[PDB]
Amino acid sequence: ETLNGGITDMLVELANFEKNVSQAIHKYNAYRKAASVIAKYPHKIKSGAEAKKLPGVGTKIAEKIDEFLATGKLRKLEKIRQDDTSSSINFLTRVTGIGPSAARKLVDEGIKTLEDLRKNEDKLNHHQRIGLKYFEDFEKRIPREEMLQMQDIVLNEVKKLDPEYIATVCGSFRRGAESSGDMDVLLTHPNFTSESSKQPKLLHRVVEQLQKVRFITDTLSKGETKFMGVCQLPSENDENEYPHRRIDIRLIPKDQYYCGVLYFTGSDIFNKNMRAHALEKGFTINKYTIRPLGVTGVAGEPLPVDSEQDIFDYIQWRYREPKDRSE
Template identity: 50%
Template structure:
């Protein structure tokens, strides 16, 4: 790994790193899921901004940031540190669990079990690989690669390659790369692919087979009838990347596209607004609520815009959903 300090990917990256570290502490050591989620939500809000927050007063005006977190942001901006994080970093258990949970597939409960069995570092984990399941072994194998963000230019090449291979199977196949990539952000954590066609033919396993034969998919973590989880790498590129491919029936597809595009906060606002308008919205369907509050049959949705129109929500381009 390059020893030079990497350039910031967004103006609030240092603040987000600290909030995410606090989120890990609350989740992994204190087991406080709600507080952990609050820190992570605040970090996500700040990461989507194209400007630097100047104070806690600025921060508290943003969605998902309350008084307590705004005060910590103010403290950091004034002093360069957060006292609560300094205290957390002195907790030996936190450092060990935080290190072990870097591995994909290892959660805080199993990390604690490993720690109690005497495994306190990634290096020791490598010597005890027999304790890991298939997913965790792959996570350990590609740990350094998975921790590196994927530049947009690489995502574009992967999208082009996946769509080209898919068209070899069926020319009318529909492929959408979702997540932060679809929202136009410069980096992504992984590749999230949705697949369907207008007749709801499920080409998932055939696509995975062809991508594997062409050397793009290098490892399988899990594979079922509707979802594949694995690892991929473009030819002439160094790093392996996490990839998920989901088949979604055509009638559910655009609800799925909306959901997996995100952001999480934008999805929450859409669902809240839908309920106010008398609908229920999730990743599978949009349904009208009856007089008793029971959802009716799924409405016909042939595009994302249909969803916005049904619930009278102004259409937002994916690049406008970075809340």
């Protein structure tokens, strides 16, 4: 719904101005919740007062709605669209590692373009310099044919270290997408549960090998359970390298792995439906666990899971292939 898009768009764009330029997080928040409550409203809104009945929509927002409905525009929006102070902050913000905070400082000093940046790397940190360096490759989509190539290399290396490992390339790729933005891997092993020790080596060991075999080129962060970095498909000669690609790797305890794989597969709206449908049956679902709900209305003790199928079974839904998870 699909009938009030003009107002919500206006709202998310006002939300974004507050975060990037005003750095006023409460106004940003109001704008976001006001947008989402309106996007689930059944009727086409014909005035500010009508909208105000919704919880989260108040005086000021109802006033802008009047203006928008009468002019098709909002002066505050048009004003800031012309102002180059914010167009700059928004552009710099497109570099992985640069947010509203770093963005402000740079433009105050006069730094506004990629060319400007490449002359001022001393004002950047590691992560930010890897962002500047590969700003273009990153902004490129990645052809599924390549994904299937990357997938091989990691899973294959993994099995060779310890056959007991389990590794799963998630995201819209798994759903069957024609392409995507980055590569996301979920990893586990039987020695690692939510009740056992704390082996950090399990991740580290698989990260090193990939570096040894020249698959991982750079690092943005690396801890006991999460890795964020850079990989690139290898080239037959020197001639034409592939674009550099982003890749995260995440270690998960065996008892929580498949709730994980479900979550990071989506779709976002699928997760909405499932979490919904898996509520009325009498359960709760998340990144980690599934619990049964109490007669009074409270969850407790995770049920046992050892496959995707197990989750569908509990909520009396039939398993659905990744393909059919867009909606």
